[PDB]
Amino acid sequence: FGSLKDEDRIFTNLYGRHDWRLKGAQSRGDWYKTKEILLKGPDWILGEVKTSGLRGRGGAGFPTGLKWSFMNKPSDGRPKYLVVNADEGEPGTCKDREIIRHDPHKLVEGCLVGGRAMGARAAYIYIRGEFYNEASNLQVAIREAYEAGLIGKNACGSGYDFDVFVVRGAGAYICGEETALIESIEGKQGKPRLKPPFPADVGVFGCPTTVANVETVAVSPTICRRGGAWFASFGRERNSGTKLFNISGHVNNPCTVEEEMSVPLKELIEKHAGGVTGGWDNLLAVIPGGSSTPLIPKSVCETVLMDFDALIQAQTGLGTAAVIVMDRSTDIVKAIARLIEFYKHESCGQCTPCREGVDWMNKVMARFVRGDARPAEIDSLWEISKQIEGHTICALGDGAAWPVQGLIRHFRPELEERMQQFAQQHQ
Amino acid sequence: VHRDTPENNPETPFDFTPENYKRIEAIVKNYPEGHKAAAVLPVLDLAQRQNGWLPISAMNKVAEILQVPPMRVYEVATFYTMYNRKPVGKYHIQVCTTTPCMLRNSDSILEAIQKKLGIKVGETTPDKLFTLIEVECLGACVNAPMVQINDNYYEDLTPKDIEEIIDELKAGKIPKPGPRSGRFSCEPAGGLTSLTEPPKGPGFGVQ
Amino acid sequence: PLMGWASTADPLSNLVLTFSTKEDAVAFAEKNGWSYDVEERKVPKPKSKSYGANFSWNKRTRVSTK
């Protein structure tokens, strides 16, 4: 892991949260060395992400240095495109909507840069419609520098210079997984494809495209700029990089922060700045991920670092990197049943495990928070959690049993006394 | 609830604005032609923009514009959330109750709203235009149990804002489209500075 | 004409046996020796079905509304 840091400094991938948020003149970081990066070959850029080894902070590994070089034909007869996601499907992420708030010019750099690694034609980005005031600034940034002739269709220095178009959904779901957004951009309803056709860079829109996250190509200019042997400075040999974090729940300042790999939760959450609940001597049930990482109690998790394998050394990994706690006021089974209640209103409905299997759990988790009849219902509920992992298509099928099964662990008398109390109430 | 139309307004009718027919040319020029064929997501949204809520004849209007079968229009607007079929009001307001928003005491930004206003839970107003529903997953659970509106967001909601945002909108004001109090930019608050400087020698790209 | 039942003559009218193949199919009809007539077994096409070609760039094999 190194020297357990993961510090917070100015030498990060952010320009400024407070410097200037509107269109500007690209003062320090934006468009510093423009033509010199693309003047080199793609083989200079392919494998340059291997110096970083950015796993992709969407919630899963399989690093971007591999999926862009490998699983990428040169050309057959048909063009290639870029899909840069921007929508946040996980509850309480907030890592997005702040990058576009004050850094609009940083993302436009790695669009042509990351596309040059693929040689794709154009750039299509997808934003939620509900983030409506912030998305208006994005086309203003296109009006700022792209409309100033800095990019496209020959700017600068080479024939490789292209555009960026903005689309919006309404209330969609295809943030949470790929290959539905490439279906929804056609105009179909949003019922995602099977995962191995021909996967997404073989069978796509009409022609094979690539899908990335925000910081999968937002850090791509500066990681191509500062490079190193610096992108692996924190963490072990497995993971590398400095990611944005977000703090919510019960804290003195629920806010974002910047850290890097392999920091333990006792120092990471309580710093910046306050621990307004019982920072110790409370229950402090922590959630490592957005939603797919279940509750971990007050044990050695606070000293367990934020490596991908450290939470794999715990019961559940977390790549979404969201922090919410439940110390004193929160009932354990009350909050998590509302998390299960949430999934009824965003399931697609294709897979017969997913459809009618979630609302199996919806009707029984509302029975436990009420307090109800005799046990061994827990184990039957636990077998259903052991019955939907790899039967569905999307990761929502994995995102439906992991909060449930992690509640079965670590909390045996979460309701063994509560449902007995209702059994004591009727008796 | 039910999702059908038992024939109240089969032909309302509805037409588009002559200012808005030319905007289609920007929309069709985006997609690759031949497989272009369906730009129904911004276009039917723009029909919601002109009308506010759209009838079933408004669905049938755009089907001849983009030569799709009209059944392939009913699939879209009955799936997504922001499209509306029933008649709606002028102000559409949303309580963003989510499970971490529940941890930020959404019960305060729950009722004492219906007692303040005079409406029912999850229900439009009896008079005209206030419609109140609840949504999930719009960014910041790191703020308060915040309030969404038609074109902006109201961060840092509070029972004072319950006595304000309902109150100022009944009067016709615009109650602070953003964080009304506290941190105006949602800053780390003890790390908000982070030594604001030029980013330590750009020009490392020899490599 | 008392109930409407399907009373009948034609004393055989219900005799089906289970044969193994076409080879001993003929050999049983001749061993007792009355007239017959033979159909032929129909097996369908194998056939060529492949998902993935249901999303085209210029072809016609393209599904929608799924």
């Binding site: - | 030319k22 905007r23 032609e33 | 085209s56 760039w57």
Partner: peptide, 28 residues
């Protein structure tokens, strides 16, 4: 923060310059 002025987003600059497109055919 303005509900209208999507023609500023759509028809102002993105209609003046697409560019070009060629967009392929795909007739089908």
């Amino acid at each position: 923060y303005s509900t209208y002025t999507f023609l500023d987003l759509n028809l102002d600059l993105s209609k003046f310059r697409m560019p070009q497109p060629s967009s392929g055919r795909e007739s089908p």
